Scaffold this active site. Structure first.
Site, PDB file in Angstrom:
ATOM      1  N   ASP A 180      -2.378  22.832  -1.421  1.00 41.26           N
ATOM      2  CA  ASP A 180      -0.982  22.363  -1.652  1.00 41.26           C
ATOM      3  C   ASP A 180      -0.450  21.687  -0.388  1.00 41.26           C
ATOM      4  O   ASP A 180       0.346  20.736  -0.517  1.00 41.26           O
ATOM      5  CB  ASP A 180      -0.049  23.522  -2.029  1.00 41.26           C
ATOM      6  CG  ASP A 180       0.225  23.667  -3.516  1.00 41.26           C
ATOM      7  OD1 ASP A 180      -0.691  23.447  -4.302  1.00 41.26           O
ATOM      8  OD2 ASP A 180       1.372  24.000  -3.875  1.00 41.26           O
ATOM      9  N   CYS A 214      -4.228  10.483  -7.712  1.00 41.38           N
ATOM     10  CA  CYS A 214      -3.588  11.769  -7.283  1.00 41.38           C
ATOM     11  C   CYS A 214      -2.176  11.764  -7.917  1.00 41.38           C
ATOM     12  O   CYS A 214      -2.063  11.479  -9.124  1.00 41.38           O
ATOM     13  CB  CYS A 214      -3.739  11.931  -5.772  1.00 41.38           C
ATOM     14  SG  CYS A 214      -3.369  10.430  -4.830  1.00 41.38           S
ATOM     15  N   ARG A 220      -4.836  11.086  -1.325  1.00 47.78           N
ATOM     16  CA  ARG A 220      -6.165  11.691  -1.657  1.00 47.78           C
ATOM     17  C   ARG A 220      -7.079  10.649  -2.333  1.00 47.78           C
ATOM     18  O   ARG A 220      -8.264  10.647  -2.033  1.00 47.78           O
ATOM     19  CB  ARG A 220      -6.006  12.904  -2.573  1.00 47.78           C
ATOM     20  CG  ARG A 220      -5.116  14.007  -2.030  1.00 47.78           C
ATOM     21  CD  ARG A 220      -4.790  15.001  -3.126  1.00 47.78           C
ATOM     22  NE  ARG A 220      -3.890  16.028  -2.667  1.00 47.78           N
ATOM     23  CZ  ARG A 220      -3.380  16.989  -3.421  1.00 47.78           C
ATOM     24  NH1 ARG A 220      -3.712  17.090  -4.688  1.00 47.78           N
ATOM     25  NH2 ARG A 220      -2.560  17.870  -2.894  1.00 47.78           N
ATOM     26  N   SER A 221      -6.546   9.826  -3.242  1.00 49.58           N
ATOM     27  CA  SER A 221      -7.262   8.708  -3.897  1.00 49.58           C
ATOM     28  C   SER A 221      -7.810   7.788  -2.807  1.00 49.58           C
ATOM     29  O   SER A 221      -8.923   7.284  -2.934  1.00 49.58           O
ATOM     30  CB  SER A 221      -6.340   7.945  -4.812  1.00 49.58           C
ATOM     31  OG  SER A 221      -5.911   8.723  -5.919  1.00 49.58           O
ATOM     32  N   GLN A 261      -2.198   8.735   3.591  1.00 42.78           N
ATOM     33  CA  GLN A 261      -0.739   8.979   3.763  1.00 42.78           C
ATOM     34  C   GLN A 261      -0.447   9.635   5.123  1.00 42.78           C
ATOM     35  O   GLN A 261       0.692   9.525   5.597  1.00 42.78           O
ATOM     36  CB  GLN A 261      -0.224   9.869   2.624  1.00 42.78           C
ATOM     37  CG  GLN A 261       0.060   9.112   1.333  1.00 42.78           C
ATOM     38  CD  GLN A 261       0.632   9.999   0.251  1.00 42.78           C
ATOM     39  OE1 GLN A 261      -0.010  10.940  -0.207  1.00 42.78           O
ATOM     40  NE2 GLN A 261       1.845   9.693  -0.182  1.00 42.78           N
TER      41      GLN A 261
END
Ligand SMILES: O=C1CCCc2nc3c(cc21)C(=O)CCC3
Length: 281
Positions: A180, A214, A220-221, A261
């Site tokens: 998370d 994501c 994450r992608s 990110q």
């Protein structure tokens, strides 16, 4: 060599510094169609948009918009579609794009709920006998099988065009163990997942581009594609150490804003490529 460059940034803790130079160096193209008022309700975040030049177009005449970018890597002969987690009102759109682009695989790198909020609509069936119909796009979607492992789940889905009665097998690769907060400690399970998708034939030029999401389709992608592409270029090149991950990241960002990110994700991407390099050689 990037393994030496790793220790350097790591021992000097320059990751926030490196990542800021990439922020600065990154392309900015127009995204006029995303910011149209009619498409306000088709975007999950207002600050994450497809560029006009690389946006995927739906073949419906009404409104062709979906938040989705085609990333073409010329040298690696690899393509990816990167998209937001679908909204409740765009699950039809999403399965139309998978149909129209002749994609074999969907890669999902988020849970439906994270940090007590919805990161994504439940866009696939949970039970063999309870199929979903998208009335708006005329598609039927059936769960055929499902193979749950510690770190990831693989589902076999049948997507049928109700208009023409053609059917296609789609594979859904779902990485269920991204924490998370932060990134995994070890990239072992992410590398296992990457190869699992690869062995499936989903990344191969005989099929349409893989769909990768994501929540925003950039963090994450971003890590997924960057690891795939770097590892493939190391196989393709006379000198594998000529592969600069900063150069490749910046080439991908011509296609979609924001890929990776955080400085954490950048570090983890080096680590995945470096560990992945050893597993091959
Ligand atoms: O972002 C979401 C979540 C659920 C689907 C959805 N639908 C609409 C909006 C926003 C969202 C609007 O901004 C206007 C009304 C339509």
């Amino acid at each position: 060599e990037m393994e030496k460059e790793f220790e350097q940034i790591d021992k000097s803790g320059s990751w926030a510094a490196i990542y800021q130079d990439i922020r600065h160096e990154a392309s900015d193209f127009p995204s006029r169609v995303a910011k149209l008022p009619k498409n306000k309700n088709r975007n999950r975040y207002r600050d994450v948009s497809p560029f006009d030049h690389s946006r995927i177009k739906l073949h419906q005449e009404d409104n062709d918009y979906i938040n989705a970018s085609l990333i073409k890597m010329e040298e690696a002969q690899r393509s990816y579609i990167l998209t937001q987690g679908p909204l409740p009102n765009t699950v039809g759109h999403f399965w139309e794009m998978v149909w129209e682009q002749k994609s074999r695989g969907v890669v999902m790198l988020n849970r439906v709920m994270e940090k007590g909020s919805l990161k994504c609509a439940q866009y696939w069936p949970q039970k063999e006998e309870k199929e979903m119909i998208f009335e708006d796009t005329n598609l039927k979607l059936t769960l055929i099988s499902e193979d749950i492992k510690s770190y990831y789940t693989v589902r076999q889905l049948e997507l049928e065009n109700l208009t023409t009665q053609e059917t296609r097998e789609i594979l859904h690769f779902h990485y269920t163990t991204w924490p998370d907060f932060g990134v995994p400690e070890s990239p072992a399970s992410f590398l296992n997942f990457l190869f699992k998708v690869r062995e499936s034939g989903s990344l191969s030029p005989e099929h349409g581009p893989v769909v990768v999401h994501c929540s925003a389709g950039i963090g994450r992608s971003g890590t997924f594609c960057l690891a795939d592409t770097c590892l493939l270029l190391m196989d393709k090149r006379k000198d594998p150490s000529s592969v600069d991950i900063k150069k490749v990241l910046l080439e991908m960002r011509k296609f979609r804003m924001g890929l990776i990110q955080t400085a954490d994700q950048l570090r983890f991407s080096y680590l995945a490529v470096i560990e992945g390099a050893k597993f091959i050689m």
